[PDB]
């Protein structure tokens, strides 16, 4: 199992961010995706998205409320998500955790939200 | 791994349902719980709850909006959930899927009863 | 004691309707079942079926003549009945009354649908 | 609660039989009546009549089809019934089961149908 994420992305604030994850494995089925956020300059990460068995589940982290949508296809080995209307509180590191049975692999994105001016 | 669910529960409508799941295994850190609903008289199931790594994740099935809370403790081998203010649309079969390192599943037939 | 019926059922006309009742208690024996009919848009109810001690007893309500059969099992806590060849005169609310040593009641709103 | 039945009655065949039941209790609304038949020389009893909530319900026992009618009044503590056109197949023991919340008391009638000649 191999997981790719771009190292960094810059997103103009107020626009949609596309958090790309592509992975490599021998195989939908039992594979699961989880995304996590680590706010910049903080010590903690919040897991906010989980996908498995054709179902999207969301955490209750307020800054991501009504902003998160699935943009992947596990058959095409794509674990991506979109975040609407990104703002500065969304600066930080995003971490994708992919599990393909037969634990799991992770890749990090440093997301920079930029001033739209 | 072994998963238990009571075969049936009756919930007076307008009150809280307590969906009990107890499991048996040798270990809670890699353990995951999922809950599904099969509305009575349909053949679809909606997966609406997932728990792994100390985090509750919820699906967007409207009849469960703002009703679902975690009532378990994986260290105490308890994968239970609560559902607030149950109404007749919540009648059906609830399925708990627990994974330890594939899943084991147990079923509840939940009947919501007229509180009158 | 707890008594459950679905809130509603839709029965295509000319076909058999299956009136489900499931109950919860600590215990056949002295337990009894009665079913009643409230025709839509009237305020009368006719009690038309009674079950106690392995015996089905029927009332003399013409629209239910030769249509009613027991489909329960008090040991499996099932108090259901069947109604053959349901027509529009059978539209209304059905009420299951279950007694285990006063009783709880549950309601079905039964809609008979054009089979065309 | 106390329940009375006559010990025996003789009914000329082809005539109506009147199965008297009178009872004693402190109270009509929750009380129920049931009547049962034990055919002479058999070991089985068939329950064929039930009365509760102002409603008469009948069993499907063929010899009592279109023969059984309520002749009581629970307010007057009378749980009687009538049987039309009694024939020899109706010989036997009749049992009245009365229930009055606040479990029930029973009384037996040995009914002899007699040749009317």
From Swiss-Prot, chains A, D:
Residues 1-102 form the Ig-like V-type domain. It comes from the Eukaryota. The chain holds residues 38 to 158 of 269 of the full protein. Belongs to the myelin P0 protein family. Phosphorylated on tyrosine residues upon stimulation with pervanadate and concanavalin-A (ConA). Dephosphorylated by PTPN11/SHP-2 (in vitro). Cell surface receptor, which is involved in signal transduction processes. Recruits PTPN11/SHP-2 to the cell membrane and is a putative substrate of PTPN11/SHP-2. Is a major receptor for concanavalin-A (ConA) and is involved in cellular signaling induced by ConA, which probably includes Src family tyrosine-protein kinases. Isoform 3 seems to have a dominant negative role; it blocks tyrosine phosphorylation of MPZL1 induced by ConA. Isoform 1, but not isoform 2 and isoform 3, may be involved in regulation of integrin-mediated cell motility. Glycans are attached at residues 13, 91. Contains 2 copies of a cytoplasmic motif that is referred to as the immunoreceptor tyrosine-based inhibitor motif (ITIM). This motif is involved in modulation of cellular responses. The phosphorylated ITIM motif can bind the SH2 domain of several SH2-containing phosphatases. It is found in: Membrane. Residues 1-117 are extracellular. The lineage of its organism: Eukaryota, Metazoa, Chordata, Craniata, Vertebrata. Widely expressed with highest levels in heart, placenta, kidney and pancreas. Isoform 3 is relatively abundant in hematopoietic tissues and fetal liver. Isoform 1 and isoform 3 are expressed in CD14- PB monocytes and pre-B cell progenitors. Isoform 3 appears to be the major isoform in CD34- promyelocytic and promonocytic cells. During differentiation in monocytic cells, the expression level of isoform 3 decreases and that of isoform 1 increases. Isoform 1 is prominent in stromal cells and, to a lesser extent, in umbilical vein endothelial cells and erythroid progenitors. Interacts with phosphorylated PTPN11/SHP-2. This is Myelin protein zero-like protein 1. Disulfide bonds join 21-96.
